[PDB]
Design a protein around this ligand. Structure first.
Ligand SMILES: Cc1ccc(Nc2cc(C)ncn2)cc1
Ligand SMILES: [Mg+2]
Ligand SMILES: [Zn+2]
Length: 313
């Protein structure tokens, strides 16, 4: 109980900021995650031995793909930590517990392919889950790991608290399906603007947690430019491989996924910032003012992509 995780001074300070990069030392990422649980939740939220065994089973079930990997899981969990730490009184005990775990598990066993490619390939998972195919699989993998012996980190919860936290995790993980984000954000925009947004309404909380999950999942676009730019290479490495697999099925991929159309990447990033990222962080900042730094960083990176197009870099 008296065993705190501490980080080196530079990490201890920078981990509190939204734009923190977890670094290239894979063996420090479990300790970074536990440090965040302990400060975000409490040293008592989880049995350290069960938590450590849960983390290492989660790690083992992420694959060696360029982007949707163990580093992404921990990066997405850090963005949730930053949001929760800047919005101390807004979230229940169960939510803080559930949401950091949801973020760590949100892409479990990702193969580097979109829901679209699974459907066109006719992957078995596509027959098992018609919509949010990979996200229903990620939640399934999470429950599977929670049921390994010595891995049930929620064992101290009551029967009703247990069902509540697994429901928080399920909705949070499903919400990382970008196809569901567009309608969710529009509904939240309308509710904020007409003044009907009510955080005591459970349906409303669910929507706000969904937007937080999109915000954390996209948080590559809220880092300092050198991080954002290098992460884009990993993102497009997956997209281009999916494009190659589309061509093998006899289907011309969308230009975003076609490695023959790399020249179009700068303009594709503009579309993505304007259609997805900026709208996402704008609505989030309206609902949770202390997340403005995510919007500010996203805007700075849009301006950097505009400079790439103008040949200034
Ligand atoms: C499946 C998936 C969806 C969105 C992202 N984030 C992105 C996307 C793009 C186009 N540019 C930068 N970041 C990554 C993966
Ligand atoms: Mg995902
Ligand atoms: Zn993700």
């Amino acid at each position: 109980g008296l065993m705190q995780f501490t980080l080196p001074v530079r990490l201890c300070k920078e981990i509190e900021l939204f734009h923190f990069d977890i670094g290239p030392f894979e063996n420090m990422w479990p300790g970074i995650f536990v440090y965040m649980v302990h400060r975000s939740c409490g040293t008592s939220c989880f049995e350290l031995e069960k938590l450590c065994r849960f983390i290492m089973s989660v790690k083992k079930n992420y694959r060696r793909v360029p982007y949707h990997n163990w580093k992404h899981a921990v990066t997405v969990a850090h963005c949730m930590y930053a949001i929760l730490q800047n919005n101390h009184t807004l979230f229940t005990d169960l939510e803080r517990k559930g949401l950091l775990i949801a973020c760590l598990c949100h892409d479990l066993d990702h193969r580097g392919f979109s829901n679209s490619y699974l459907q066109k390939f006719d992957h078995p998972l596509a027959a098992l889950y018609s919509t949010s195919t990979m996200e229903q699989h990620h939640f399934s993998q999470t429950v599977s790991i929670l049921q390994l012996e010595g891995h049930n980190i929620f064992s101290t919860l009551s029967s009703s608290e247990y069902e509540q936290v697994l429901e928080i995790i399920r909705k949070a993980i499903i919400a990382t399906d970008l196809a569901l984000y567009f309608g969710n954000r529009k509904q939240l925009e309308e509710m904020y603007q007409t003044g009907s947004l009510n955080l005591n309404n459970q349906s409303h909380r669910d929507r706000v947690i969904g937007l937080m999950m999109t915000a954390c999942d996209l948080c590559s676009v809220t880092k300092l430019w050198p991080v954002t730019k290098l992460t884009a290479n990993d993102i497009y490495a997956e997209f281009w491989a999916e494009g190659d697999e589309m061509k093998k099925l006899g289907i011309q991929p969308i230009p975003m996924m076609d490695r023959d159309k790399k020249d179009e990447v700068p303009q594709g990033q503009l579309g993505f910032y304007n259609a997805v990222a900026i709208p996402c962080y704008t609505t989030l900042t309206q609902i949770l003012p202390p997340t403005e730094p995510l919007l500010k960083a996203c805007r700075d990176n849009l301006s950097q992509w505009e400079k790439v197009i103008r040949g200034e870099e």
